[PDB]
Amino acid sequence: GSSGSSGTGEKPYKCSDCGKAFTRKSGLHIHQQSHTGERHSGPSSG
Ligand SMILES: [Zn+2]
């Protein structure tokens, strides 16, 4: 079967956007908040 028990590292979470492995579920969540990018329909540039 496929359960893991292979990856030595301790990053149970990986950003499926860029490719960054995080050890803490949060370390990633907070990182993702940045990916969302700052945009606002209009002349607003970031
Ligand atoms: Zn990312």
Side-chain angles (χ1 to χ4, degrees):
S2 178
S3 45
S5 200
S6 191
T8 180
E10 55 197 306
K11 284 89 193 273
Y13 310 111
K14 175 90 90 284
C15 187
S16 198
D17 295 33
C18 59
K20 272 164 157 73
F22 304 84
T23 298
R24 41 164 89 179
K25 57 276 210 272
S26 54
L28 163 63
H29 271 233
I30 294 89
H31 155 65
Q32 272 273 17
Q33 296 293 88
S34 294
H35 271 297
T36 65
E38 191 64 26
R39 190 168 186 164
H40 206 341
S41 54
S44 178
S45 167

